[PDB]
RNA sequence: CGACUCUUAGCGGUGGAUCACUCGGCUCGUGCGUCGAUGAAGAACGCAGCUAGCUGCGAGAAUUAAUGUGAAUUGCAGGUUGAUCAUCGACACUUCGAACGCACUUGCGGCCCCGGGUUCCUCCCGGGGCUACGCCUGUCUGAGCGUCGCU
RNA sequence: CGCUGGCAGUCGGCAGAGCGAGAAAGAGAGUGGCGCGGACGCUACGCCGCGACGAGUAGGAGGGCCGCUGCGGUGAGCCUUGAAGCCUAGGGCGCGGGCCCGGGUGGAGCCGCCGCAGGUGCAGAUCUUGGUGGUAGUAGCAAAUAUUCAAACGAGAACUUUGAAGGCCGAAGUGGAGAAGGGUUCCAUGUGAACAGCA
RNA sequence: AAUGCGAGUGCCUAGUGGGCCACUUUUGGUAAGCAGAACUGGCGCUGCGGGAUGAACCGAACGCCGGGUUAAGGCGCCCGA
RNA sequence: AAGGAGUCUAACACGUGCGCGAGUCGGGGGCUACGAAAGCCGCCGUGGCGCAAUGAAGGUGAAGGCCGGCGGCGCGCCGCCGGCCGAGGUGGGAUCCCGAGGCCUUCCAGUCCGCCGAGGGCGCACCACCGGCCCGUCUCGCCCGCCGCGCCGGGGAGGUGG
RNA sequence: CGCGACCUCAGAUCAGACGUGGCGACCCGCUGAAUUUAAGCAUAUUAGUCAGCGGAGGAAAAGAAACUAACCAGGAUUCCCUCAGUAACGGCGAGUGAACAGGGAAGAGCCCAGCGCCGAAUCCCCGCCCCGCGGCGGGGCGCGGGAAAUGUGGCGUACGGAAGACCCACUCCCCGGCGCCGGGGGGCCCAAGUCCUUCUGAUCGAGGCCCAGCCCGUGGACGGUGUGAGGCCGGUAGCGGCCCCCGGCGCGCCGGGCCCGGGUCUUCCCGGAGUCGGGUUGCUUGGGAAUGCAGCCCAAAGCGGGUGGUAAACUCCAUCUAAGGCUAAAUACCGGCACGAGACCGAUAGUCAACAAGUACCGUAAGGGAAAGUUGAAAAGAACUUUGAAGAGAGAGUUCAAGAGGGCGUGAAACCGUUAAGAGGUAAACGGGUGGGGUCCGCGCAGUCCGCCCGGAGGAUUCAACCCGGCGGCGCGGUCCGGCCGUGCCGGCGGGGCGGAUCUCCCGCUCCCGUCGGCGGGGGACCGCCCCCCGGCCGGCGACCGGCCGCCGCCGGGCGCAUUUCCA
């Protein structure tokens, strides 16, 4: 029976909700597990960055967010083709690639091309054979100063 | 303070593992201190007690300057029977009064091939700790 | 357990049979036969409103109030009467913001810590902790809370070069980093005024963590010290000031008790 | 005064409350996350010097071997080249059970190989190995007035 | 309950001790004609003074230095020179909830204060479980004709055993054998604790 | 105009929603300790003195006490007078 | 004798305490024995709620007044460019401001510090009312704009619904 | 007639393999209610939930768009926050109820069929030789056997691909052994009091341990030991040690494979059918002229098809490529193994089960299902004497204690026995008021002290005042010298850090010819605040003072020799 004044409330507690109750008492336990897995991965890829491959400059759709910019899934094949990077070799040097992306504009395309060029200038590439250097790789003075990057590679700022 | 996450501080768990310990664990549990004459000679503070050890009581009714051979090491009630610590029953038959090994101090060890090795292991591991401190 | 008191199969005998209509255990040649199964009043059975795991155990407190309580607990530790009323034996302590030098962090033996606490005249608090070590009262002894004592002085350090190992075996001594100050250890029991021993590298970062009233905190994003509701709090000196005293009426301190009415007739 | 009855106290019974203990639960969290035709889970029946239950084990039956440890087990007897415990990687593991020769009475077989019997002559007895269903690949033996080719 | 009353003025030899009185306002400043002394107070969430008032079901609110259990602090708390619990024709306090001492019993832990938390207070629910009364040494040990004498064993005999009687079942039996079911109840010896509603 | 009294205002809100009795007015009914209304007071929710007894009648409403005096009733004895 | 019955979670309302304040909140994530705690992040404030309402919706979206010059209507109005003033008023209203005069010691003038006070004011919050503005809708109407001169867009006055 | 192929189909205790069943907390595929709510009830709600059935794994499932969107566009799946109790569904009642965008946790992509080109270039099995040999593999032979042209393998898959030619560029990828180089499991061990007095039945209690403040402490967690132990013992701490086993991370070598790419033109090729889709029926969904699924009927196309949240026609757009397949992680876990912890319960509680508990017992059965902890520190568990047939006693003895005597810690209430006291014909009990008798208490039975003064008997190493030294208080020392602070204020031929939606030499990259314009990036200037040095006042030192000086107070030591002062 309703009281004098109040809301008409519709609580969704008419099923057997007490069977499917999810408690969060293992939340500080899963945070430590995720942190230990993150640090184990970061030690497994020792000079590679801990965040992973570099993500491209991406506009957001759906007019509430069309002014912001974001990290996307991968660089498009048009962007890699203009930058001069083969699509099956880009994933070996930490460039994230997805083939689904299109390039409607020119300004975002050239921005991601410049993004690829500046990452390629910053890439310190170790020889495939450690005892013998190769042609397209870094010299020995840069490998001894090569460290591990923390956080996202070339962070995206509005 | 204990920092090992795999060692328990639970009272019931420690009481359970103590009172349901296997016999070779009860041997290490039922250890006795050495006298100060043997301590300076062997550099060993305590040893597990054996059957043929001469030992001296320091606590209870039977404490004094008397030294007795262990009659037996009855590890089921966590206790030893020593040579002259005994009690007359009603009928006149004497039975051994049990003393805990922690309330009794060894004045003479029974030296076997293994118990020399135990003293040497304890002495080496004490001198490694002394060298680590120094 | 949610199955407690409900693992039985039982149905009420109903009216008739001169029994009180409670559910009863089905059949059998045993003691548990028509014996009363469900309900809070019955032996065995299920309790009234069984406790559930999804009770709100945790509370969240606003960050500004947590910092405000940290500031109030820290400012109360530099006052004499408030640390005396916490019971800490500090009658021979030379200064109440007890600040020591930075070689204290390089201590690695507890003998150095004990000797430092004796030279700072703080060892009488550890003696009071030793005198206050006793057994607990009640059911906490069989729930791994058998021995209780008194919280002693708190030692605050900037960097750890062995000071936690040097001090951690002394009963009552707790160690807190400057950047990780805990209200639960700065004011144990909810009462302000715990005795604190600082180092100078510890003492020179409080103006960086909290700021003054004109310079904001540099290690926090945007935190200032809270404002005072009342600047001069010594209302005795406020009240017997000539500014206030001239603008008062005369005090009417004469007691006029009741008059016994005599009959004039 | 006495019997009986009522009240209170002392002491004694009946009863097992209260309190103090706790090798037990409940809840939360972590790591691992592994059964079976090479016979699982479950069940039955046995096994100890004196042994009913519980526990452990399987005719090698409160255990064998190996390794670690190092002088006991124990309620009573009996007897360091390693007693007892723990680990367990070797060996062993009765009957029913998906349960497997046919059935479920603990009944009836069939084939092969051995030992007594006999002196390969089949009987009889004892022992051992095979003998379930479905299905995959291959083999062997076949069927068809199925489609043909040739004598 | 109201006076949304009064008291920071304990203003002391750096002193002058007051604001109850019918009549808005200052015991105001300047400018010219010896003896070293003086109770209590004020946990201001405290203390003090005047009046008026006091019923209570359902119900609502406030205060509990009322009570139980556990946690964070705190009593340089209590304790084998005796804790908890229990008993008491003992001494008391509080309107009350309740509490503190004395004696005895007992043998190992317990409490006060400031906060926190709850599975936190019983006279009832034909409440649950366990225990015990009156009834009450009462109802009752009454279906199927019946027992008696002597002896033995034994601490003990109406009931056991043996003998002598008197009886019954009276061949569709109170006889002699099986099936189902039972599972050692069969047989020998010993016991008389418990059972065989007397023994 | 007299008399008397400090008022005004806003939220949240339990319980209740079977009633009954009496003077007067009054409907149906032969009538009812019957059924149904109006007004006010009670009982319910409330003890106390009296009506011997007593939900409602008369008096009077209640913190724990001492002294005095009354109300409604009473003052042969029970039983104060 | 013992056990024994308004509990826990979620949602909402109102009151109360705290912190910050047109903002506030890390609850999710990440960094770095008690501690599964505490601390920190600010280009982790995404996001929630509040700061703007109204209409079914397309949509729209919260003072004006005076003066000078110009154009039109026949001294006022409308439209058009420049200047200045500017967030309403009436009544009640705690508090606060001024002060005619006065608060004694022998007697008058006589400055400063206070205290009271006739009368007069600025008026907090809040209430009643009258106006004003925003959105929907109705009625009466005359005008202004240009890139598309139009079944275009924008405005005025008077009621009324939120 | 016979013989030989192929097809289709049989039988074998043929040779070699595989499946069955269990558990099932979490997962996948079906099937599937009614209690209940709607204050009735039938649609709805309960709820795609309980029950039923099948199938797995350490996770499962899902998963690299026939997608979201309508934007300046994003870009596999799974999970968290928010969207959101919203759009929407609903006797539009009760109630039900998503998705996108955004922020994160994690992040990984791929392979066929077709279409084509390569001498079937491919795969399986048996015999022998040597090696590996405890997850049955490697090379070498076999005029050995099969599978496969009704299509195996290599290239190749929607992100395009293939082939030829032109150019540029590759000499190092994978696995298996041999042997060598620095996390997990197990075993053993490592500090310091039984030091002196003292309580006890026993101490782990209490007191002390000098100037190494008893000793150790990277060890003061816990447990045991005759109460309550850092130092008696096991342990605990420690990037502590020693000894085995397994695995990972690497190097050298042998036997093998693989004999490889990128770019611009040119010529070719390119897709999954009783499936999409349509009608209808039934279930389902928030999905509403039909969200998904399924039965029946109809039944495709290739500038095609699907989607574009209102049915339909026309016309543009946008976006994917269905009808084939694989894939870790973040996520779930009341079952199992092994652990740790607790503001939980403390034997009528907590699991039914602290104990010979799914046991005893009941029911033909499916099933139902208890009760039940405590001697003592140590059995030292009561020898022996005596009565009785014995159970039972009486002595004696043990123990600190039998007032702990084998269901024995503490031992309440109800109920009963006895002793003592009091009482008794209106059942008992009760409230108020006294009285009497008891039991104990007041450790009652000559009755309170305190201050001042006077009087009388005494006794001190004694008063005031002065001297010296120390300490404290106050000081408008009108304004003494020196410091410190200021949620104080101004200045500067001052040095610096944060912030700004105040402005502007080199540098990356970009359009047009080393020239010439926009934009990503460090200075540099400006402004605000703060910090540190300088001068000035102001104000404080009562949350925050030092030295001299002055006054006062107190202490200690002198001097005071007693008409002072004090003591009983
Ligand atoms: Mg209501
Ligand atoms: Mg229960
Ligand atoms: Mg208690
Ligand atoms: Mg009695
Ligand atoms: Mg047996
Ligand atoms: Mg062996
Ligand atoms: Mg061995
Ligand atoms: Mg048969
Ligand atoms: Mg009242
Ligand atoms: Mg009593
Ligand atoms: Mg509780
Ligand atoms: Mg009761
Ligand atoms: Mg009778
Ligand atoms: Mg017979
Ligand atoms: Mg017969
Ligand atoms: Mg009998
Ligand atoms: Mg009536
Ligand atoms: Mg009333
Ligand atoms: Mg009345
Ligand atoms: Mg009458
Ligand atoms: Mg009276
Ligand atoms: Mg009368
Ligand atoms: Mg109770
Ligand atoms: Mg509020
Ligand atoms: Mg075969
Ligand atoms: Mg279905
Ligand atoms: Mg209904
Ligand atoms: Mg109903
Ligand atoms: Mg119904
Ligand atoms: Mg199910
Ligand atoms: Mg299966
Ligand atoms: Mg498995
Ligand atoms: Mg999978
Ligand atoms: Mg998505
Ligand atoms: Mg919302
Ligand atoms: Mg309707
Ligand atoms: Mg639904
Ligand atoms: Mg999304
Ligand atoms: Mg991320
Ligand atoms: Mg092919
Ligand atoms: Mg694709
Ligand atoms: Mg102990
Ligand atoms: Mg001591
Ligand atoms: Mg200890
Ligand atoms: Mg000590
Ligand atoms: Mg030790
Ligand atoms: Mg040790
Ligand atoms: Mg260790
Ligand atoms: Mg389909
Ligand atoms: Mg259905
Ligand atoms: Mg439905
Ligand atoms: Mg369209
Ligand atoms: Mg449409
Ligand atoms: Mg596909
Ligand atoms: Mg697919
Ligand atoms: Mg798949
Ligand atoms: Mg923990
Ligand atoms: Mg139980
Ligand atoms: Mg109990
Ligand atoms: Mg007991
Ligand atoms: Mg005793
Ligand atoms: Mg006892
Ligand atoms: Mg005890
Ligand atoms: Mg007892
Ligand atoms: Mg009597």
Numbering used by the authors:
A (entry chain K2): 2 to 159
B (entry chain X2): 1 to 134
C (entry chain C2): 55 to 319
Which text from the study accompanies this structure?
Several decades ago, it was recognized that cellular tubulin concentration is tightly controlled in part by a feedback mechanism termed tubulin autoregulation. The only known component in the tubulin autoregulation pathway is tetratricopeptide repeat protein 5 (TTC5), a recently discovered factor that recognizes an N-terminal four amino acid motif common to nascent tubulin polypeptides emerging from translating ribosomes. Here, our biochemical and structural analysis reveals that TTC5 recruits the poorly studied protein SCAPER to the ribosome. SCAPER, in turn, engages the CCR4-NOT deadenylase complex through its CNOT11 subunit to trigger tubulin mRNA decay.
To understand how SCAPER binds tubulin-synthesizing ribosomes, we analyzed β-tubulin-RNCs engaged with recombinant TTC5 and SCAPER by single-particle cryoelectron microscopy (cryo-EM). The structure, at an overall resolution of 2.8 Å and local resolution from 3 to 8 Å for non-ribosomal regions, showed that SCAPER’s CTD makes contacts with TTC5, the 60S surface, and an additional density that was identified as the 28S rRNA expansion segment ES27L. The other parts of SCAPER upstream of residue 859 were not resolved. In this model, K97 of TTC5 is positioned near a negatively charged and highly conserved surface patch on SCAPER around E1338, explaining why the K97A mutation is defective in SCAPER interaction and autoregulation. Furthermore, two conserved positively charged surface patches on SCAPER contact the 60S subunit and ES27L. At the 60S interface, R907 and K910 of SCAPER abut 28S rRNA residues U2707-C2709, and R934 and R941 of SCAPER interact with D145 and D148 of ribosomal protein uL23 (respectively). At the ES27L interface, a cluster of eight conserved positively charged residues between K867 and R878 along an α-helix from SCAPER faces rRNA, although details of this interaction were not visualized at the moderate resolution in this part of the map. SCAPER variants with point mutations at the interaction sites with TTC5, the 60S body, and ES27L each failed to restore autoregulation to SCAPER-KO cells despite high expression levels. Thus, SCAPER uses its CTD to selectively engage TTC5-containing ribosomes through three crucial contacts. Furthermore, the region N-terminal to the ribosome-binding CTD would extend toward the 40S subunit and potentially reach over 300 Å.
